[PDB]
Every structure is written in structure tokens, then in C-alpha cells.
Amino acid sequence: QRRHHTDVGFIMDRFVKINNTNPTHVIDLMQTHQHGLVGALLRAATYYFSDLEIVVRHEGNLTWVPNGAPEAALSNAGNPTAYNKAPFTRLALPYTAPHRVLATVYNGTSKYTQLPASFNFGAIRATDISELLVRMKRAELYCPRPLLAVEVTAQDRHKQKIIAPAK
Amino acid sequence: QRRHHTDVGFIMDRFVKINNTNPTHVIDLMQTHQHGLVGALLRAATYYFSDLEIVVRHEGNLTWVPNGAPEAALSNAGNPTAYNKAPFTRLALPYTAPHRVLATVYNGTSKYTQLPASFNFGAIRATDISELLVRMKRAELYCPRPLLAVEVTAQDRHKQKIIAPAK
Amino acid sequence: GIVPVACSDGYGGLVTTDPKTADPVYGKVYNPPRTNYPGRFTNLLDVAEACPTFLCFDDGKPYVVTREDEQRLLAKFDVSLAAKHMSNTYLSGIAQYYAQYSGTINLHFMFTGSTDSKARYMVAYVPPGVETPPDTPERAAHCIHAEWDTGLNSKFTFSIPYVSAADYAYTASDVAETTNVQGWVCIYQITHGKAQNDTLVVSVSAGKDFELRLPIDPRTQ
Amino acid sequence: GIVPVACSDGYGGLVTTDPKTADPVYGKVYNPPRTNYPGRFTNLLDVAEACPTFLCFDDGKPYVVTREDEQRLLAKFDVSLAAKHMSNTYLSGIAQYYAQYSGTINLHFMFTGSTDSKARYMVAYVPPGVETPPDTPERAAHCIHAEWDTGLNSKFTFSIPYVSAADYAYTASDVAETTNVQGWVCIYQITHGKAQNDTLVVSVSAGKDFELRLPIDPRTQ
Amino acid sequence: ETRVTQAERFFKKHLFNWTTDKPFGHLEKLKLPTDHKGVYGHLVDSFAYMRNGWDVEVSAVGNQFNGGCLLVAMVPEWKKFTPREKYQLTLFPHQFISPRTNMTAHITVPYLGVNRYDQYKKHKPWTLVVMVVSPLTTSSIGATEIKVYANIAPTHVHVAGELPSKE
């Protein structure tokens, strides 16, 4: 047997769209769709470590402030500013959260259903952002959690149609 | 003598147009023209194994689901998605079929004149696909089958015009 | 002069799974160490092997109760990763994102009945052969099967062999191909003593040589 | 600085037979083993050599029947890969896809008549010389020829030598160049005894040094 | 999987009656496996997955005073042939049957197909093919007709997945 395709560093190393994008977006890996490939295999772990590569389709210059920087630091070019090329901008970001590893479920709060505001990879700003893709590099997952398959109402099995070359 | 040009790994490794292209096309090598060079040499062998390179001219993003993925998996970008460049898209697809070798003639059926639907290299989807070329990389053939030359009705020979530089 | 290059046509597009890295934007950042962090898994099939999970029987319960009837067939379920009896399984949760698979699948049986009640059980596997599985408790002795009695050790594992035509099999049972896809497993009760409501919980784990092949994104988004 | 490059003009376009590969989209896929799969062929001319195939004579039959007439000439056919007598041959099937060829072509003779009937045959090759091939069985004894007598061994092979002007010869007989293009092989019956409907089937295989050169796509599509 | 030794045994068969009015190209086929009334039939109906080759022997009863030729071949993944490629059936493993020289053919083939195991109730990989190369010619001292026989046996039978009885 050859389990190279079930590797945790291989299956999570692909681009995934983040549906909610704003002019000023805070990059959170929890904003991925819960039923996607990487989205669900991420919800299937309690703590995750990863770098990040983003493909952003924007208008104007894109500024990226690291985690913990004030919101007012997004209006200055001292923070990494990428000038927009023709198709889009493809960057590689580091991990900037103070915690050793991030988490997908938090049991409680952090201020003296909603993860702490410190669980993010930074922020990005432009005049607007049309699409945003995130790619996890050298991802590591900890403490597996239940992973759910699709339910079947009354038929014996889930009947999905496979691609067929039938003429 | 130097028989390098009748080598089975050399003749089959060229691009051939697949005439029938659809917005959702399932890549099957039997869709090659039967009288073309690679097409006829493929029909001349019972079984064949090969990788693939596809040159696709399309509008919108091109998604490729491997052999066996549900047809509903073509609407998601988690599967390998190629964003369209100017001229066309040139990819390299592996052999994804479960069988050790594919077949060109099948004696019978596969369900408890028509090859089973598991003989394909995957499916590709875009808004529309203008043209599609396929290339057989590291092709191997098994169990040779009869290959026919064009017939001549009543002449002594097939009488074809060869290119001449005559002024 | 300088290096002459040929800007090839068809290359250079973004593919959401290309193996090339991006240009760094914020260099020389050292993250906090995470050495010997508890509970790290590098392969989804390693945790599939490690922890078996329960099946979902009729009425939605992880166990089969003894039936006080002439029917000696307690339960019967298809051996597939997209079935009813495997709907709430972690193995199905993994396999829904892969197009093909191959290898052994293990079934683990646990008895949760009272000690003063004794029973004998037999499990049989039927490959995609006969059009009707051997509902008769003796007709099923001719296929691959194993038996175990109840005692102090209420745990017993049964391995479902991988039998099929192709080298690899689909994890995605087709809308076509009616009747038995490949296989069903039948549980038989050889005998039972004073067991009217005694239960038996069935769990399934990936085999030692199980393997999933082609990552896909099949779910509707 | 960074490396400077020159975007050359005229390079980079797609040539449907360029030797450069594409960027992989789906990595680390290991296909099921096909070690020791029976009947693998790596060169078309190998199976052309090992497997002789039949010729298509008049009326569309692969054998010569004895003619009870003064004509001692059993048959005559063009020695070319585009001839009538070679229209249903595997060698012609391969050669139709190449522009040039060179090398020997073997002919295999099989006697399928009754044992109590004996006959003697001669075959001769006529290079592109005389305007009329030697129809009479005496004029042909001056050419390259061989003879074999029928008996227990009904197998006999005869090799057509490659004679032409250029090192390499076309496989795509031209509209021009009428008359005998290159050559005809004639089969003569020296004698026959009580053979009125006895046959002789003729098959052709590629020579040990046959070679085809320039792949083309000549058929209409 | 296990190998069976009791199923590898001969089985006489009648192919056709070789007469004088059948011209060249009279093609007779016999897909394997046929209806086996012995151990092999129970193996087919009581086991699901099997793989095996075939050793075919073919004899025509006649005399040396007749003429004609029979081509016997084992076509993998049989398909109907128009009279054009009947001239090329020598490509598959084959021998000739002609009353002048030989009296009995002998062809052995391995197991081959897209699947490592096959269910012959659906797929029949190998096929016996016998044709008249030259028509049977007879005189006042020759036999007016010849009956040919099949002689076949599965070789190296390997099976997995035993099936229950039907009683």
C-alpha cells in the first residue's frame, strides 16, 4: 500500500477559496467552507500549524499588516505593500500569531461559538478584493475530531453519478 | 538499419485533436479519429497504458476531476483548477483509472460495442472548450491487432499526389 | 550577450494545486517552538487505523439486539464506504474525499450483555457472487467466515477481505449498478441463553493495508 | 540585480510534436503495477517481422489455384507497399503512415494441396528494368530466382531484395511515374500432377532489415 | 487466493463441419469459457473472481488425399471482423491446420485483461477462432467432408472469494 495521498502535509497543500471577502479582510482559516476538502479536513483537527500563500485579485495596492498590528496601520505603505500586476497578486505570508499553535474550537472566552480575535494570520486591505485564495504550507494537525460524511435519508446508499465517457 | 521512428514510444507521443468537445468533456482516448496516425496505431493494439498532456483552449477556469470522482465534483475549485491564460492551457494528467491497463475492444459488459465508463482519464469542465489536444506520454501497447490500409477499387495501386516543388 | 528565453505558450497559468512556491513578503520570522506537542498525526489513515468508530444500525443505534423470533439473521449490511451502516463512520468521513481505495477493512465486535446470559455468534462475508445472500444460517457456512463464543473476552475482530475485479475500487457507489455493489456481511446467532434484550455493538476500522488514492472535492458548496 | 533574459521572437509557440513536457497538475499518483504483462510490443516492425500476413489476389483470395491452361504464369503482382496484392497486409497497414522505407521484404509460400498431387514452382524478381517482365518461364530464369519442390515441408520463404536508385524509397506511390514503378514478382509452375484445384497461399512479412522512416498522417480526416 | 488442480482437465468440443462449399474466410468462433458441465462450472458459479489461461488443441479428421488449410488462433478481446482484416488474423497466437502437412494444432495463452481477476459470467477475454484459409478440395478418392474438434483446458486457475451454495 502507498498512503502518499492521505498525508496531512499533502492533502492540505492546495488553494482554497474564502467566500467572504471585504475591502479590509482579516485572514482566518476558519472562514473556509466547512464542507470543502481542506475546510473539512481542517475542522477535523483541534490545533493546526501552517504558513500561508495567498492569491488575491484586487484593485490598487494591497497592504498586509501582521497579527496584532492596529487597524490604523493598514493605511501606511511601510507595511508590506504589493503593487497590483495584471492577473492578481501571489504572496507568501508567515505565521504571526503569538500562540504556538492555533485552534478551531475554543472552550470559553479570552476577555476578562466565537474563537479569540487573536486567531488570524494578519489583515489585507485594498480598494477592493474580488477573490482571495489561501494555501497552507507545511501544515500540521493535532488532536483529531469527528469527521462527518453525508447522510442518506431513506435509500440504501448515497447514489452519486460518476463522470462517464458514455456517448 | 535504424528503426527509431517505428518505436511505439515515439510515434504515439504527439498531439492529436479530439474532434468532439463539450463544455463538460470526459477524456477518453477512444474518441480519437480511427484513421489518424496515433488513432489508428492505438486501435491496432488491444491494451494501452499512458500518461497524458492536454492542451485546452477554453473560456473561464478549467477544472479536472480524476477518474471516479462524482460529476458534481466539477463545480468546485478544490479539484485542480487552471485559470485561463491568453493562448490556451497546457497541463499534465496522470493515469487515474483503477485498471492496470486500459482496453480498446471489450468482450462483454461490466454491469450486473461500448467500452465501460471506467476507461477514461478524467473529466474537464469550463464555460466552453474550444479545442482539446491529448498527448500520450510513456505509452505502451499490448497484444497487437490488425491494422488496415486504404483500399483501391479497380486501379493497380493507390494513386496519390506527392508534394512536388515544380514551378 | 544575455540569456535568450522562449516564453512558452500554455504555461505560466495559476493552477490551484501547482507545486511551485510564492515569493516571500515578510522574511526571517521565527515562530514559537511546538516541539513534542501532544497528539500529532501525519496521515489520516494512521488515525483511521488507530480508532475504530461505531456503525449506524436501524433506528439509528450502534448495536444489534437479540431478536426473539425464528429469524436467525440479526442484521445484514453492505460492505461499502458510502452505505447506511457506514454513514456515521470516520472511515466514510475520510473516504468521501477520495475517488478510489483498496485494501482490507476490519470489523471489531464487543459484547455488552449480562454475564449470566451466554450466546454464540458467526460472521460471514459474501463477495459479489450469488444474486441472493445466504440468509440461511447454514447456507452461509460455505463462504469466508469466522466464529467466536462469548466469555470473559467480549472483544473480537473480523477482517473483511478486499475482493474485486480492478486493482482499486471506487469509494463512490454509482447511481447506476443496482443490486449488491460488491459485498454484504451477515451476523448470525448460533445460540442464546436468557438473552431477550442483550446487545452487541459493532465498530469498524481501516485495515493495515487500506489505502485511499485520488483527492477530490465532491460536496456541494 | 537579477538575471536578465531576452524574450526571443518566434519561439514559444505550440508545435504539436515538440519534445518538452508540461507542468504536472496532480502529483504522487502511483499506478497499479503491470510487471510481466503478456504480449507487450515496443516496435511495430518487430510484430511485422514475427507475424506474416496474407496477400489479396484476384477475386479476393489469398491463394493461387492451378490453371489448366497453356499459360504457365500463375500470378504477377507489384512489389510495393501500396499495391493491390498488398492492400490487406499488416506491413502495408504500418507503411501507410510513413513516407519512406528501405530494406528486404520476405515472402512465405504454403502448399495446401493434396499429398498425392506433386508440383514444382519457381519464383523470380524483376527489378525496374525491362519494359515487360519475363512472362515465359524461360526468360525469367535469368533473373534473381529460387526454386523449391513440394513435399513434407510445404513451408518455403523467399526474400525480395531491395533494389532502387536512392538509399530510401517512397511508400506512397506517386500519381506520376507510370508503368512498372519498381518491381514485380512472378510465380511459375514448373510442373503439376493431378492438381486441378490445388492451392498455394502466399504471405508476406517484413525483412530482418526493413525500416520505415518519416511518420506522416496521410489519411483524410 | 488459491490455485485449484482439479479444474485443469481437457474437454472435447465440436467446432464445425468442414465441407467443400465453404470458401475462404468462413469464420467459426468459440468464446472461452464455454458451458462447462464439470468442476469448472461449479467454480464459475460458486466463486466470484478467477483468473486462468487456456491450452487449445484442434484436430481435423480426414486423409492426405484432401486439400485445404485451417487457421486456428486465440483472439484476445474478440470482435467481429469484416473480410478485410481476416487476412491479418496471423497477428494473434496461431497455427495452421492443413491435411497435407499437419493434423493437430497446439496453442497456449496466459491470462490477460484490465482486471487482475475476472468474472467470466460477464467478460470473456480469450476466444477460439478457426477459419478456412483454402477451401476443402476432394476427388473421387478423397473424403467429401471433415469434422474438426475442440480440445481445451483452463491453466493456472487462481480464484478468490468463495460463494455460498444455492440449496
PDB file of C-alpha atoms in Angstrom, chain E:
ATOM      1  CA  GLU E   1      -6.371 -16.576  -3.378  1.00  0.00           C
ATOM      2  CA  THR E   2      -5.812 -20.284  -4.022  1.00  0.00           C
ATOM      3  CA  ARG E   3      -4.942 -22.419  -7.035  1.00  0.00           C
ATOM      4  CA  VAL E   4      -7.144 -25.385  -7.953  1.00  0.00           C
ATOM      5  CA  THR E   5      -5.684 -28.513  -9.551  1.00  0.00           C
ATOM      6  CA  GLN E   6      -8.882 -30.487 -10.222  1.00  0.00           C
ATOM      7  CA  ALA E   7     -10.256 -27.923 -12.701  1.00  0.00           C
ATOM      8  CA  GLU E   8      -7.327 -28.200 -15.152  1.00  0.00           C
ATOM      9  CA  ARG E   9      -8.551 -31.006 -17.371  1.00  0.00           C
ATOM     10  CA  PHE E  10      -9.381 -31.467 -21.040  1.00  0.00           C
ATOM     11  CA  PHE E  11     -12.829 -31.004 -22.555  1.00  0.00           C
ATOM     12  CA  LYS E  12     -13.714 -32.236 -26.027  1.00  0.00           C
ATOM     13  CA  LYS E  13     -15.742 -29.904 -28.224  1.00  0.00           C
ATOM     14  CA  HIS E  14     -17.226 -29.807 -31.718  1.00  0.00           C
ATOM     15  CA  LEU E  15     -16.366 -26.659 -33.668  1.00  0.00           C
ATOM     16  CA  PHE E  16     -17.990 -27.119 -37.094  1.00  0.00           C
ATOM     17  CA  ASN E  17     -18.210 -29.401 -40.120  1.00  0.00           C
ATOM     18  CA  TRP E  18     -15.526 -28.533 -42.681  1.00  0.00           C
ATOM     19  CA  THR E  19     -17.153 -29.072 -46.085  1.00  0.00           C
ATOM     20  CA  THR E  20     -16.161 -28.184 -49.647  1.00  0.00           C
ATOM     21  CA  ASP E  21     -18.764 -25.450 -50.250  1.00  0.00           C
ATOM     22  CA  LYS E  22     -17.342 -23.151 -47.553  1.00  0.00           C
ATOM     23  CA  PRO E  23     -14.990 -20.634 -49.232  1.00  0.00           C
ATOM     24  CA  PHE E  24     -12.057 -18.744 -47.745  1.00  0.00           C
ATOM     25  CA  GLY E  25     -12.918 -16.612 -44.745  1.00  0.00           C
ATOM     26  CA  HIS E  26     -15.589 -18.920 -43.342  1.00  0.00           C
ATOM     27  CA  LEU E  27     -15.079 -17.936 -39.716  1.00  0.00           C
ATOM     28  CA  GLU E  28     -16.124 -20.013 -36.703  1.00  0.00           C
ATOM     29  CA  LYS E  29     -15.616 -18.796 -33.141  1.00  0.00           C
ATOM     30  CA  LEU E  30     -15.997 -20.223 -29.643  1.00  0.00           C
ATOM     31  CA  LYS E  31     -15.691 -17.768 -26.741  1.00  0.00           C
ATOM     32  CA  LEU E  32     -13.995 -19.182 -23.655  1.00  0.00           C
ATOM     33  CA  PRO E  33     -15.035 -20.285 -21.124  1.00  0.00           C
ATOM     34  CA  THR E  34     -17.992 -22.173 -22.611  1.00  0.00           C
ATOM     35  CA  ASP E  35     -20.724 -24.058 -20.725  1.00  0.00           C
ATOM     36  CA  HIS E  36     -18.593 -26.363 -18.566  1.00  0.00           C
ATOM     37  CA  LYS E  37     -20.602 -29.209 -17.029  1.00  0.00           C
ATOM     38  CA  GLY E  38     -17.730 -30.333 -14.795  1.00  0.00           C
ATOM     39  CA  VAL E  39     -15.795 -28.879 -11.874  1.00  0.00           C
ATOM     40  CA  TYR E  40     -15.085 -25.639 -13.747  1.00  0.00           C
ATOM     41  CA  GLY E  41     -18.776 -24.749 -13.976  1.00  0.00           C
ATOM     42  CA  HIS E  42     -19.133 -25.125 -10.217  1.00  0.00           C
ATOM     43  CA  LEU E  43     -16.016 -22.979  -9.825  1.00  0.00           C
ATOM     44  CA  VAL E  44     -17.527 -20.269 -12.038  1.00  0.00           C
ATOM     45  CA  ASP E  45     -20.916 -20.245 -10.313  1.00  0.00           C
ATOM     46  CA  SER E  46     -19.597 -20.795  -6.764  1.00  0.00           C
ATOM     47  CA  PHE E  47     -16.638 -18.408  -6.850  1.00  0.00           C
ATOM     48  CA  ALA E  48     -16.727 -14.778  -7.944  1.00  0.00           C
ATOM     49  CA  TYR E  49     -13.185 -13.819  -9.015  1.00  0.00           C
ATOM     50  CA  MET E  50     -10.952 -16.071 -11.083  1.00  0.00           C
ATOM     51  CA  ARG E  51      -8.043 -15.920 -13.494  1.00  0.00           C
ATOM     52  CA  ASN E  52      -6.801 -18.578 -15.887  1.00  0.00           C
ATOM     53  CA  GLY E  53      -5.304 -19.189 -19.304  1.00  0.00           C
ATOM     54  CA  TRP E  54      -6.181 -21.805 -21.893  1.00  0.00           C
ATOM     55  CA  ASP E  55      -4.407 -24.546 -23.822  1.00  0.00           C
ATOM     56  CA  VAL E  56      -6.334 -25.253 -27.006  1.00  0.00           C
ATOM     57  CA  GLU E  57      -5.773 -28.303 -29.189  1.00  0.00           C
ATOM     58  CA  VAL E  58      -7.530 -28.613 -32.531  1.00  0.00           C
ATOM     59  CA  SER E  59      -7.734 -31.701 -34.741  1.00  0.00           C
ATOM     60  CA  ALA E  60      -9.448 -32.315 -38.085  1.00  0.00           C
ATOM     61  CA  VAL E  61     -10.156 -35.923 -39.059  1.00  0.00           C
ATOM     62  CA  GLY E  62      -9.528 -36.613 -42.737  1.00  0.00           C
ATOM     63  CA  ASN E  63      -6.875 -38.049 -45.043  1.00  0.00           C
ATOM     64  CA  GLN E  64      -3.909 -36.970 -47.146  1.00  0.00           C
ATOM     65  CA  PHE E  65      -5.946 -37.054 -50.385  1.00  0.00           C
ATOM     66  CA  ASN E  66      -7.780 -33.830 -49.460  1.00  0.00           C
ATOM     67  CA  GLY E  67      -6.572 -30.252 -49.611  1.00  0.00           C
ATOM     68  CA  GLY E  68      -7.337 -27.145 -47.622  1.00  0.00           C
ATOM     69  CA  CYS E  69      -5.997 -25.019 -44.809  1.00  0.00           C
ATOM     70  CA  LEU E  70      -7.387 -24.041 -41.404  1.00  0.00           C
ATOM     71  CA  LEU E  71      -6.013 -21.131 -39.391  1.00  0.00           C
ATOM     72  CA  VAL E  72      -6.580 -21.597 -35.656  1.00  0.00           C
ATOM     73  CA  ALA E  73      -5.923 -18.613 -33.408  1.00  0.00           C
ATOM     74  CA  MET E  74      -6.777 -17.304 -29.948  1.00  0.00           C
ATOM     75  CA  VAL E  75      -8.032 -13.726 -30.247  1.00  0.00           C
ATOM     76  CA  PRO E  76      -7.916 -11.653 -27.028  1.00  0.00           C
ATOM     77  CA  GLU E  77     -10.978  -9.409 -26.616  1.00  0.00           C
ATOM     78  CA  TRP E  78     -12.748 -10.798 -29.663  1.00  0.00           C
ATOM     79  CA  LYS E  79     -14.561  -8.533 -32.114  1.00  0.00           C
ATOM     80  CA  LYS E  80     -16.377  -9.183 -35.379  1.00  0.00           C
ATOM     81  CA  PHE E  81     -14.119  -8.881 -38.438  1.00  0.00           C
ATOM     82  CA  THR E  82     -15.132  -7.593 -41.843  1.00  0.00           C
ATOM     83  CA  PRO E  83     -13.500  -9.688 -44.614  1.00  0.00           C
ATOM     84  CA  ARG E  84     -10.753  -7.065 -44.912  1.00  0.00           C
ATOM     85  CA  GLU E  85      -8.896  -7.851 -41.682  1.00  0.00           C
ATOM     86  CA  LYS E  86      -9.451 -11.605 -41.978  1.00  0.00           C
ATOM     87  CA  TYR E  87      -6.162 -11.507 -43.917  1.00  0.00           C
ATOM     88  CA  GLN E  88      -4.390 -10.299 -40.747  1.00  0.00           C
ATOM     89  CA  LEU E  89      -5.515 -12.845 -38.133  1.00  0.00           C
ATOM     90  CA  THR E  90      -1.971 -14.241 -38.021  1.00  0.00           C
ATOM     91  CA  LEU E  91      -1.069 -11.424 -35.603  1.00  0.00           C
ATOM     92  CA  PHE E  92      -2.550 -13.276 -32.604  1.00  0.00           C
ATOM     93  CA  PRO E  93      -1.015 -16.559 -31.405  1.00  0.00           C
ATOM     94  CA  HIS E  94      -1.919 -19.016 -34.124  1.00  0.00           C
ATOM     95  CA  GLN E  95      -1.122 -22.191 -36.011  1.00  0.00           C
ATOM     96  CA  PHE E  96      -2.209 -23.704 -39.315  1.00  0.00           C
ATOM     97  CA  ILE E  97      -4.178 -26.887 -39.958  1.00  0.00           C
ATOM     98  CA  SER E  98      -3.758 -28.378 -43.432  1.00  0.00           C
ATOM     99  CA  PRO E  99      -4.218 -32.088 -44.242  1.00  0.00           C
ATOM    100  CA  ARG E 100      -1.067 -32.170 -46.386  1.00  0.00           C
ATOM    101  CA  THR E 101       1.445 -31.460 -43.603  1.00  0.00           C
ATOM    102  CA  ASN E 102      -0.053 -31.411 -40.088  1.00  0.00           C
ATOM    103  CA  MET E 103      -3.014 -32.961 -38.294  1.00  0.00           C
ATOM    104  CA  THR E 104      -3.310 -31.197 -34.914  1.00  0.00           C
ATOM    105  CA  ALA E 105      -2.619 -27.693 -33.600  1.00  0.00           C
ATOM    106  CA  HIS E 106      -1.485 -26.634 -30.131  1.00  0.00           C
ATOM    107  CA  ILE E 107      -1.835 -23.092 -28.745  1.00  0.00           C
ATOM    108  CA  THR E 108      -1.255 -21.940 -25.166  1.00  0.00           C
ATOM    109  CA  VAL E 109      -2.086 -18.466 -23.839  1.00  0.00           C
ATOM    110  CA  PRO E 110      -1.823 -16.762 -20.439  1.00  0.00           C
ATOM    111  CA  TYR E 111      -4.495 -14.836 -18.541  1.00  0.00           C
ATOM    112  CA  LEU E 112      -4.761 -11.185 -19.523  1.00  0.00           C
ATOM    113  CA  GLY E 113      -7.220  -8.356 -19.033  1.00  0.00           C
ATOM    114  CA  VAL E 114      -7.764  -4.987 -17.433  1.00  0.00           C
ATOM    115  CA  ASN E 115      -8.666  -6.517 -14.042  1.00  0.00           C
ATOM    116  CA  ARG E 116      -6.388  -8.778 -12.012  1.00  0.00           C
ATOM    117  CA  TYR E 117      -9.400 -11.079 -11.579  1.00  0.00           C
ATOM    118  CA  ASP E 118     -12.340 -11.547 -13.927  1.00  0.00           C
ATOM    119  CA  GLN E 119     -15.925 -12.769 -13.633  1.00  0.00           C
ATOM    120  CA  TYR E 120     -16.399 -14.844 -16.778  1.00  0.00           C
ATOM    121  CA  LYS E 121     -20.181 -14.667 -16.469  1.00  0.00           C
ATOM    122  CA  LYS E 122     -19.658 -11.116 -17.817  1.00  0.00           C
ATOM    123  CA  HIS E 123     -16.301 -10.947 -19.639  1.00  0.00           C
ATOM    124  CA  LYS E 124     -14.692 -13.500 -21.971  1.00  0.00           C
ATOM    125  CA  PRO E 125     -11.106 -12.382 -22.666  1.00  0.00           C
ATOM    126  CA  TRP E 126      -9.854 -15.188 -24.904  1.00  0.00           C
ATOM    127  CA  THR E 127     -11.683 -16.607 -27.906  1.00  0.00           C
ATOM    128  CA  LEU E 128     -11.073 -19.570 -30.186  1.00  0.00           C
ATOM    129  CA  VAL E 129     -11.027 -18.661 -33.880  1.00  0.00           C
ATOM    130  CA  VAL E 130     -10.931 -21.173 -36.745  1.00  0.00           C
ATOM    131  CA  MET E 131     -11.252 -20.247 -40.418  1.00  0.00           C
ATOM    132  CA  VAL E 132     -10.807 -21.778 -43.855  1.00  0.00           C
ATOM    133  CA  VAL E 133      -7.670 -20.381 -45.486  1.00  0.00           C
ATOM    134  CA  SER E 134      -8.058 -22.572 -48.580  1.00  0.00           C
ATOM    135  CA  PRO E 135     -11.285 -24.450 -49.349  1.00  0.00           C
ATOM    136  CA  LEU E 136     -11.539 -28.179 -48.810  1.00  0.00           C
ATOM    137  CA  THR E 137     -10.964 -29.897 -52.157  1.00  0.00           C
ATOM    138  CA  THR E 138     -11.890 -33.537 -52.710  1.00  0.00           C
ATOM    139  CA  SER E 139     -11.832 -36.063 -55.535  1.00  0.00           C
ATOM    140  CA  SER E 140     -13.346 -39.485 -56.223  1.00  0.00           C
ATOM    141  CA  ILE E 141     -10.779 -40.912 -53.761  1.00  0.00           C
ATOM    142  CA  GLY E 142     -10.963 -38.171 -51.121  1.00  0.00           C
ATOM    143  CA  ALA E 143     -13.238 -37.611 -48.136  1.00  0.00           C
ATOM    144  CA  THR E 144     -16.259 -35.471 -49.000  1.00  0.00           C
ATOM    145  CA  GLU E 145     -16.253 -33.803 -45.565  1.00  0.00           C
ATOM    146  CA  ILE E 146     -14.148 -33.316 -42.433  1.00  0.00           C
ATOM    147  CA  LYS E 147     -15.245 -32.836 -38.816  1.00  0.00           C
ATOM    148  CA  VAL E 148     -12.910 -30.756 -36.642  1.00  0.00           C
ATOM    149  CA  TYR E 149     -12.805 -31.000 -32.834  1.00  0.00           C
ATOM    150  CA  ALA E 150     -12.028 -28.603 -29.920  1.00  0.00           C
ATOM    151  CA  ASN E 151      -9.657 -29.714 -27.174  1.00  0.00           C
ATOM    152  CA  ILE E 152      -9.430 -27.135 -24.380  1.00  0.00           C
ATOM    153  CA  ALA E 153      -8.469 -26.778 -20.705  1.00  0.00           C
ATOM    154  CA  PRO E 154      -8.073 -23.941 -18.168  1.00  0.00           C
ATOM    155  CA  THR E 155      -4.494 -23.490 -16.969  1.00  0.00           C
ATOM    156  CA  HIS E 156      -3.123 -21.989 -13.746  1.00  0.00           C
ATOM    157  CA  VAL E 157      -6.596 -21.272 -12.381  1.00  0.00           C
ATOM    158  CA  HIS E 158      -6.499 -18.827  -9.460  1.00  0.00           C
ATOM    159  CA  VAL E 159      -9.620 -17.904  -7.521  1.00  0.00           C
ATOM    160  CA  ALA E 160     -10.675 -15.761  -4.575  1.00  0.00           C
ATOM    161  CA  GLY E 161     -13.910 -15.066  -2.745  1.00  0.00           C
ATOM    162  CA  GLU E 162     -15.828 -18.336  -2.407  1.00  0.00           C
ATOM    163  CA  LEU E 163     -19.595 -18.139  -2.860  1.00  0.00           C
ATOM    164  CA  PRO E 164     -22.316 -19.860  -0.823  1.00  0.00           C
ATOM    165  CA  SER E 165     -24.369 -22.756  -2.109  1.00  0.00           C
ATOM    166  CA  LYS E 166     -27.765 -22.341  -3.767  1.00  0.00           C
ATOM    167  CA  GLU E 167     -29.638 -25.147  -1.973  1.00  0.00           C
TER     168      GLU E 167
END
